[PDB]
Amino acid sequence: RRWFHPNITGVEAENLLLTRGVDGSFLARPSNPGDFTLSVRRNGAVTHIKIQNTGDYYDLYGGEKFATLAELVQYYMEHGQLKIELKYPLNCADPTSERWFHGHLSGKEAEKLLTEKGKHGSFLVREPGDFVLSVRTGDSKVTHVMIRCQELKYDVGGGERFDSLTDLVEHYKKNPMVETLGTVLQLKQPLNTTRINAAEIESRVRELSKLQGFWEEFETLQQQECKLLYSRKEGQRQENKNKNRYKNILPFDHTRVVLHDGDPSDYINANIIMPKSYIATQGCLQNTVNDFWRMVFQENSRVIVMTTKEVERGKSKCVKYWPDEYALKEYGVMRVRNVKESAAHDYTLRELKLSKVGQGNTERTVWQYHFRTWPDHGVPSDPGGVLDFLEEVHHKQESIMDAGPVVVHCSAGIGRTGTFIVIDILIDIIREKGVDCDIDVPKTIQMVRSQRSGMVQTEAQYRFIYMAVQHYIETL
Ligand SMILES: CC1(N)CCN(c2cnc(Sc3cccc(Cl)c3Cl)c(N)n2)CC1
Asked: Could you say what the effect of mutating residue 449 to W is?
């Protein structure tokens, strides 16, 4: 993912592509903050293509919709689809989005962090133009290795000279430095500085709010998305193409929900998310409504969380897959009765009875929580509404013996869906373990992203997750 440059301007991108790149060279960068730009060299000139993300997916102008920028780049690198060829990534030497880079951090602060939070092989790199690599080794001690910047290259006092700190760190990760008395300076894992005690969320949010800290942390998490390019072959099959809301937003094969008692049709664009478990899925299409009810029935799910209106901005985000109040409908082999609807400030609850046609004894109540007030773009200005809704959903799920995973869906099933699920996972740790628990927001999001592509889409949702956890702790 070195083709992503976090701090460059359009003019800097043009100069880099014209002087250091060739026809086919490309890079991606942040823009209108919140948007991204794909800058590509074609026939000696540079084109800048807009990538928009309001919270549901990355929408590339003149291209398709994607779950992640890594999935977008992999797609165009492996497929005449962009109207523009993406042949050569133009690599970024900026270390600001590396997990181990801590810019302005003093040697005392670094020794304190490695001593309190580190273990064998924990390391960090901190900054007049030179850098310091600090490593903890043991069962213990901290060793500081000077990294010189001499004529644009980096070195540890001898040997190879690297074009970037990333190349240096990767080199000495593969080929560890050995102290002449035997100690191997193993760079096993970056020092974890994101894991906080829940009671100090206010302090961490205040520090992330200064010039912003939230942006740096989010883009450092985004930089790790290239480790999550898991196969999605089942969703790519000809017979499954029209079962996807967006052709390139697909479920990972290894966590997808497989539908078993089919017409003698094992596919649905949905994934199991394990942290209480969840099913993260897209809004129904007219041709997937029956598959949706087959999934809910098979998985024994008793609670559904819908995080979109049926229509937003004049566009269908989810077809109505449930009957009108008091009505009974058959959706293939499944029968649904809408027993009763209850309106609340931010949501509507629909009490549904689901059963298999011809088998009365299979009836179970499915409670559908339909959140109605999420803004068309961005996130809510206050998390209270989302928190009170998730608290109600949680108590409903907890009251039902052996209930299956909670189904959560929005439009593509990754942005608002990932946001609700991640807040739910974090607040569950705090409800049970109390305020004396460790929480790690990027760790939790990375874990959820390994089970469905692009879970949590934007820096605005990333910040909303911290705000929701802070609010939950303040009302404890
Ligand atoms: C100060 C910094 N420049 C920015 C903040 N920081 C940093 C480091 N790593 C991450 S990702 C991450 C975190 C925990 C577990 C997993 Cl699994 C992952 Cl993937 C992140 N979002 N931020 C340390 C370096």
From this structure: In LPRD1; reduced phosphatase activity
Which experiment gave this structure? X-ray
Class of domain 10-89: alpha beta
Give start-end residues of each CATH 3.90.190.10 domain in the chain: 219-475
Residue nearest to atom 17 of ligand 1 (CA): 443
* Residue 410, beta-bridge partner list: none
- Residue 459 CB–ligand 1 contact under 6 Å: no
CA of 450 to the centre of ligand 1 (A): 16
Q: Which CATH superfamily is domain 219-475 in?
A: Protein tyrosine phosphatase superfamily (3.90.190.10)
Residue 89 tokens read as: 């990534």
Q: How many residues are there in the chain?
A: 476
Mutation probe of ligand 1 site: the residue of 96, 99, 169, 222 with most atoms within 8 A of C-beta: 99
**The two three-digit tokens of residue 18, written as one number:** 């014209």
451 is known to lie in a ligand binding site: no
Residue 412 counted as an annotated binding residue: yes
- Asked whether 204 lines ligand 1 (CB < 6 A), one says no
Which residue, judged by its Cα, is nearest atom 8 of ligand 1?
A: 99
Please tell me whether 410 is known to bind a ligand: yes
Resolution (A): 1.9
Which one, of 336, 323, 321, 328, lies nearest residue 366 by Cα?
A: 336
Expressed in angstroms and rounded, the spacing between residue 194 Cα and the centre of ligand 1 is 6
* β-strands 406-409, 278-281 pairing: parallel
434 is in an annotated binding site: no
Tell me if 213 CB under 6 Å of ligand 1: no
